Amino acid sequence: NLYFQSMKSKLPKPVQDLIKMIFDVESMKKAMVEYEIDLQKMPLGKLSKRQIQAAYSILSEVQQAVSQGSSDSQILDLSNRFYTLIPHDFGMKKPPLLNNADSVQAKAEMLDNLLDIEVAYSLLRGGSDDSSKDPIDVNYEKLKTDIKVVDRDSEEAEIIRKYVKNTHATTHNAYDLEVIDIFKIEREGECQRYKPFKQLHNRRLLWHGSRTTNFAGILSQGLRIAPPEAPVTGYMFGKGIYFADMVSKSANYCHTSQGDPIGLILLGEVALGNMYELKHASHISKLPKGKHSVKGLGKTTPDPSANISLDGVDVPLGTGISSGVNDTSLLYNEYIVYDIAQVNLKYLLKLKFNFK
Numbered sequence: 001n002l003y004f005q006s007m008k009s010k011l012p013k014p015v016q017d018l019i020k021m022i023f024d025v026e027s028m029k030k031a032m033v034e035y036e037i038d039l040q041k042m043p044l045g046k047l048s049k050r051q052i053q054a055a056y057s058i059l060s061e062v063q064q065a066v067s068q069g070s071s072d073s074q075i076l077d078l079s080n081r082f083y084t085l086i087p088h089d090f091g092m093k094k095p096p097l098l099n100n101a102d103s104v105q106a107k108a109e110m111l112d113n114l115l116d117i118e119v120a121y122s123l124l125r126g127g128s129d130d131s132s133k134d135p136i137d138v139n140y141e142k143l144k145t146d147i148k149v150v151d152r153d154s155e156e157a158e159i160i161r162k163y164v165k166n167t168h169a170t171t172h173n174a175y176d177l178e179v180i181d182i183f184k185i186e187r188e189g190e191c192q193r194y195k196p197f198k199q200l201h202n203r204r205l206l207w208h209g210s211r212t213t214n215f216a217g218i219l220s221q222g223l224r225i226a227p228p229e230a231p232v233t234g235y236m237f238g239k240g241i242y243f244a245d246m247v248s249k250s251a252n253y254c255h256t257s258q259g260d261p262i263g264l265i266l267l268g269e270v271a272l273g274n275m276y277e278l279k280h281a282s283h284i285s286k287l288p289k290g291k292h293s294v295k296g297l298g299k300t301t302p303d304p305s306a307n308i309s310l311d312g313v314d315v316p317l318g319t320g321i322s323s324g325v326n327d328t329s330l331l332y333n334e335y336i337v338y339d340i341a342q343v344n345l346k347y348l349l350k351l352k353f354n355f356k
């Protein structure tokens with residue numbers, strides 16, 4: 001042409017850092033190490049969906065054996081089959097026999113994380129690996145998600161920072177949160193998928209935290225419901241998509257540590273409709289007619305008189321008050337939907353966790 005075209009990224013610097021953080025191979029590897037996976041038998045590139053599906057089904061059979069009665073033989077078999085799919089490093093300490101709810105639930109949570117890691121990794125290795133363009137921009141494109149920095153002095157940013165400041169507490173005072181960057185995101189196709197559900201009333205802007213190593217999968221594919229193969233163990237309100245109205249609650253699901261103290265949390269617009277309100281666990285197959293979601297009532301709720309609207313989207317950013325709620329085990333509210341299309345992701349926050 002007339003111009004020299006640099007091989008540098010065409011993205012702004014905070015977006016570049018976001019892409020590097022979510023495609024960080026070192027983090028993928030650390031996760032594998034923490035799970036004690038044998039990395040020579042099962043390297044990052046060897047993880048597959050079919051493998052993960054089959055391992056979930058095994059865990060469901062373990063769960064059925066725990067609730068409905070087991071033999072030693074059966075349990076040993078299921079453990080052997082699980083570890084054949086997800087090989088364990090014998091250089092490390094003996095792996096747990098899968099014969100109890102905690103182990104089942106820890107392994108299911110491993111599989112959720114590994115699935116998103118596999119997604120990230122396959123996106124990363126796929127494509128034209130030619131230098132026709134910057135690696136950062138190529139990996140950005142693969143997310144099929146528009147990501148823009150929200151200007152810090154814009155209305156949106158002031159509202160968002162307020163939602164964070166107010167709904168962060170002195171209870172989970174392990175850390176305070178600091179907003180580093182606010183991104184506006186739009187996943188390809190999601191607005192169209194969401195449209196019909198926009199018709200329902202009670203649309204709310206709610207938090208959803210997750211591990212950083214899951215975000216490539218989250219952005220490329222959107223928030224998902226655990227598959228049918230996955231065990232039900234540990235799903236307080238069954239297999240759906242869970243959100244909080246207090247940033248403190250969602251931030252726990254970032255599983256950030258003093259070692260890596262930055263996490264990512266979403267704000268999504270969720271079409272709740274009529275809410276089935278509950279005070280304790282209850283695994284949900286069907287929902288009562290008239291209801292389109294569940295709300296788990298907590299001891300603490302954002303002050304409803306300090307609530308705001310956006311596009312006719314309720315933003316419950318009031319400071320946390322005692323809900324007055326009688327006989328509940330939940331510290332905080334939760335909201336669950338059972339159809340992936342009831343969610344429209346709007347923002348992604350990068351936060352600093354300042355531990356004490």
Ligand SMILES: Cn1ncnc1[C@H]1c2n[nH]c(=O)c3cc(F)cc(c23)N[C@@H]1c1ccc(F)cc1
Binds near residue numbers: 109210243244245249
């Ligand atoms: C599995 N899952 N799917 C969507 N969200 C989630 C988790 C969770 N993710 N992110 C959140 O912010 C969150 C906010 C809550 F108030 C409550 C939540 C969550 N419970 C969820 C939970 C449930 C079962 C489980 F074995 C692990 C974690």
